[PDB]
């Protein structure tokens, strides 16, 4: 079986590169962040623009939703994160403390914590209610490209240009595991699998790898796309067939069969690096978004 993703909507309106797109956990919305300093919210099923959220002083590199779909957190070149009330558009808190661009961010499932990574080579864990920085982890020796909580929030995975993926204990802040491979190419993206047993890691040698992080074994590799320069989001697609989904520097979305590692589809239509993809929580829908020469988000749908 192969999916048959077809283009349904192109969402225009950002005036600079789009940096990240994420579906709300309840499925109703897509949020996008951009180098144009804005977050935009779009209807996930009709592509209709809903609203613009503003207040960062420089461009945004990431955005993430709380579990109840009511809050967003954004990570900006202005060295802060902001927590937003989606319904009002209001900035509830500004998280200050990183000393360089904030690159990546995520809520835990409970959504009482935010995790961030930054060009300042640290990982920070913040209290959502108060905005206080609870812990600063001296996590890496180079910019931190991704941070993600596992399904019960007890672990954080982090990746960095220093070539390392690390697993952290949320409560204690200690490093539980360091993953290294080959000649330590920069690690540009990492995230846990939905069941929390694996991590998917991108490296800037045109390669994605699925790891059993506790056993420290590489179970799968996904290749054939182009990824040498940018921190491109990748995804597990689980609503239909079990796929790996990633953007690419050759302007395509790649979809692989997770078990066989074969490419099952390439989605054409963007005109710049596809920096970000996201998979809808219940329907076979992909969101994709691209950099400066494109500036659009595309919504794709498959029968499987």
């Amino acid at each position: 079986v192969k999916p048959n993703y077809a283009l349904k909507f192109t969402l225009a309106g950002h005036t600079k590169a789009v940096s990240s797109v994420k579906f709300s956990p309840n499925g109703e919305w897509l949020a996008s962040s951009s180098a144009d300093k804005l977050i935009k919210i779009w209807g996930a099923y009709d592509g209709k623009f809903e609203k613009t959220i503003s207040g960062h002083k420089l461009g945004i590199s990431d955005v993430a939703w709380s579990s109840d779909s009511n809050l967003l957190v954004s990570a900006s070149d202005d060295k802060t994160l902001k927590i937003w009330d989606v319904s009002s558009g209001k900035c509830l808190k500004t998280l200050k403390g990183h000393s360089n661009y904030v690159f990546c961010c995520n809520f835990n499932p409970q959504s009482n914590l935010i995790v961030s990574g930054s060009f300042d080579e640290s990982v920070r864990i913040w209290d959502v209610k108060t905005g206080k920085c609870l812990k600063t982890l001296p996590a890496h020796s180079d910019p931190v490209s991704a941070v993600h909580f596992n399904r019960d929030g007890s672990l954080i995975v982090s990746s960095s240009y220093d070539g390392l993926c690390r697993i952290w204990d949320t409560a204690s802040g200690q490093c539980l595991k360091t993953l290294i491979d080959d000649d330590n190419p920069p690690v540009s993206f990492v995230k846990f699998s939905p069941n929390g047993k694996y991590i998917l890691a991108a490296t800037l040698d045109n390669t994605l790898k699925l790891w059993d992080y506790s056993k420290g074994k590489c179970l799968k590799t996904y290749t054939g796309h182009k990824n040498e320069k940018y921190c491109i989001f990748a995804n597990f697609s689980v609503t239909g067939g079990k796929w790996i989904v990633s953007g690419s520097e050759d302007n395509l979305v790649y979809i692989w069969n997770l078990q066989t590692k074969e490419i099952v589809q390439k989605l054409q239509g963007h005109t710049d690096v596809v920096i970000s993809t996201a998979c809808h929580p219940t329907e076979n829908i992909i969101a994709s978004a691209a950099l400066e020469n494109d500036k659009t988000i595309k919504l794709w749908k498959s029968d499987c």
Partner: peptide, 8 residues
Amino acid sequence: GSARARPS
């Protein structure tokens, strides 16, 4: 701009 939209 934003760091993620710039190449390394």
